[PDB]
Amino acid sequence: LPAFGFAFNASAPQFASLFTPLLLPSVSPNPNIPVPVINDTVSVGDGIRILRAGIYQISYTLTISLDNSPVAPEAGRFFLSLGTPANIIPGSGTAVRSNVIGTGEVDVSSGVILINLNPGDLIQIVPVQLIGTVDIRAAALTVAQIS
Amino acid sequence: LPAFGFAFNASAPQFASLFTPLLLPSVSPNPNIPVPVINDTVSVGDGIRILRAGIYQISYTLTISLDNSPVAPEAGRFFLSLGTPANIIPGSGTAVRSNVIGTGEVDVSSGVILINLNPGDLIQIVPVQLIGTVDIRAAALTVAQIS
C-alpha cells in the first residue's frame, strides 16, 4: 500500500504570512464515514511529514481573497517547502496579483509535483513574497506515493 | 515501477506564442537531493515523450501575468497536445481573459487528465489562442502512469 496523506483547512480563513506554513488542521474529508486519510505519513497541523522513501506526487490548492486588504496591490507567491520554510521546492511555485480592488476570491493550484522524498521530510505550503494583505480562505495539501 | 516524468520551468519567464510548446528545462525539483524525476519517459526540453503503453494522468500548471502590455484585452487558451502542437487533447483545455490592462499574475491548472498513451507520444503544453501579450511566469508538466 502506498504512503499518502491529505491535510486541509475548511474551517477558518488565515492571512498569509512570510515563510509561515499554512494551517491545515483536518485530515478527514468523507462527510459520511470520516476517517483520517493518512497512511504512513504524519499530519503535523501545518504540513505532512514523510516516513517512507519513494517517489511522491505532492500538490496544493489555495482559495485566496484579494480584497481583504487596506492597500493595493494584493499579491502572493507560494511554494512547497522541504523540511524548513525557506527550503522551497522549484516547480511547486504559484503566484497571483491584483493591482486594483475589483477582485475577491481567486483560485490557485500547484502542479502535481513529482519528487523523490525521504523519511523525516516535512512538506509545508509557505508564502515567500506578499504585497498587501492576502487572505487564505481555504487550502489543502496532498501527498501520495507513486509505486 | 510506473512510468513517470515531471518537467518544469522555474528559471525564466517566457512569452506564450501560438502553437509553440512551452519551455520546461528542469526535471529535478528536490532542493536537497536533486535527481531527475524521470522513469521510462524522456524530457525533451519542451515536453515529455512516452515510452511505455498505459493509462496516465497528465496535467499542467501555468502562472500567467496579464499586465505586461499597453494594449487590451489580455487572453490565452492552452491545451495539452499529443505528438504535434496542433493535435490538442480535449479535456485538457484552459483559458484566462482580462478585458482590461493591468491584471497581474493569475493561476491556471488543467484537470488531472486520465488518458491512454502509447510509446512515442509526445506531450506538450501549447497556447492555442492568444490576444495581447501573455507572460508565462512559470509552468510545469506532469506525466504519471496509472497502474
Binding site: 522551497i88 | 522555474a10 528559471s11 505586461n68
Partner: peptide
C-alpha cells in the same frame, strides 16, 4: 538558492496605494 530567483516571480510591482 535565493527565493527571489525561483519562478514564478511577479512581472511587475506597481506602487502600493490606499484604495
Amino acid at each position: 538558492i535565493e527565493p527571489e530567483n525561483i519562478g514564478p516571480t511577479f512581472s511587475a510591482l506597481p506602487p502600493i496605494y490606499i484604495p
